Homo-oligomer: A and B are copies of this chain.
Amino acid sequence: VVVVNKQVLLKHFIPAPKETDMELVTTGTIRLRVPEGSNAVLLKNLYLSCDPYMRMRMTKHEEASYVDDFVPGAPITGFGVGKVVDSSHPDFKTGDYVWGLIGWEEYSLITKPQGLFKIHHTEIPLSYYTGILGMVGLTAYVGFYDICSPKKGERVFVSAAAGAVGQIVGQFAKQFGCYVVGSAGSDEKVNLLKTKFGFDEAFNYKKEPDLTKALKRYFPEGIDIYFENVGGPMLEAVLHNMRIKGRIAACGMISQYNLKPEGVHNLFLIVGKRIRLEGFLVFDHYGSYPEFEEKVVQLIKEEKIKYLEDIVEGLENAPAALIGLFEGRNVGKQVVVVSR
């Protein structure tokens, strides 16, 4: 059996990204069997994740950064969920479902199957393994329980709080016993934070004249913990409102990914307030996954965590949905359905 395999390719390096910086192609095929003699796994790709860090990979870097750049002319890759068609690797059998880095394509031959995780709970919707039970959820789990060193009762702020990482941090934090406030870019998202996601309070950053004062309002006694997804002047504001011994988990600074650079002027406050500002990367924490899968599956089962996906249908729509990320167009975790 040789079948058609559509692909989305990076046309070329970027210096914001445009939908034209990628190209769907239909003039390609794959054999539905793993090469003889390999330790490899062939996946039918079911779901894709759009993640902001994918932007960086579309630019060429002289010195090595944290992930390999994309190769022009080759498919885009990123997190996704797949079904095992064929396998010459012992830990994976035909009919198993998995998640991990795969190609923006209908079918991927995974030469390094050590970096695929087997899906242990079929009871759960498979798309969850793009986000809440995939990379994004684990990011939240590490960022909050580990980097933020939280303590019950502490005052927690979360930027980009309706996003995939944000919405999870908030719920983790409320269930730990913290006061949790979120910021987002639309009243629809703010509504979701207060009504679906259980946030003690939230507000629209686009519709607040002074971020520093806005935060003073929700944190009269200042902020103990800032889960940082956005960066820029929102960080300055937070710094102004941080409490002695406050902690900032630097998850991302998405405001800067396509800009060029914006400056932070408050940093000296980190001294007077004895703040720990610490970045982290989820790739370093895959060891914590098994415990995390169990915690979060139970949380879902018990209806004690909520999760909103933004779903887009068809591989052809993946470039748009990725670009859309950066303009706030996603309402929840951006997933692309390749086949169901």
State the A residues within 8 Å of B (CB): 65-66, 231, 235, 250-253, 256, 261-281, 284
Contacts and interface: CB of A to CB of B under 8 A. Distances in A.
Given A235-B267, A250-B271, A270-B278, 8 more contacts: A65-B272, A231-B267, A251-B271, A261-B266, A263-B265, A270-B279, A272-B281, A273-B279
Query: Lowest 7 CB-CB distances: which A-B pairs, in order?
Result: A263-B263, A261-B265, A270-B279, A271-B279, A66-B272, A276-B278, A253-B268
Q: Which of A231, A250, A264, A271 has the most CB of B within 10 A?
A: A271
B267 A250 contact: yes
A272 B279 contact: yes
Contact of A231 (B251, B252, B268): B268
A230 to B, nearest CB: 11
28 contacts: A65-B272, A66-B272, A231-B267, A235-B267, A250-B267, A250-B270, A252-B268, A252-B271, A253-B267, A253-B268, A253-B271, A262-B263, A263-B263, A263-B264, A263-B265, A264-B265, A271-B279, A271-B281, A272-B279, A274-B279, A274-B280, A274-B281, A275-B278, A275-B279, A276-B276, A276-B278, A276-B279, A278-B278
Contacts of A251: 271
- Copies of chain A in the complex: 2
Contacts of A267: 231, 235, 250, 253, 264
A110 to B, nearest CB: 25
Contacts of A271: 250-253, 279-281
Q: Is the interface of A mostly helix, strand, loop or mixed?
A: loop
Contacts of A256: 268
Nearest to A270: B279
A179 to B, nearest CB: 21
A251 B270 CA distance: 9
A186 to B, nearest CB: 24
Contacts of A275: 278-279
A278 B277 contact: yes
Contacts of A269: 279
A146 to B, nearest CB: 12
Contacts of A279: 269-276
Contacts of A250: 267, 270-271
Contacts of A235: 267
Nearest to A269: B279
A244 to B, nearest CB: 9
A211 to B, nearest CB: 16
A40 to B, nearest CB: 29
Nearest to A266: B261
Q: Name the residue in A256, A265, A269 with the highest tally of chain B Cβ atoms < 10 Å from its Cβ.
A: A265
B265 A270 contact: no
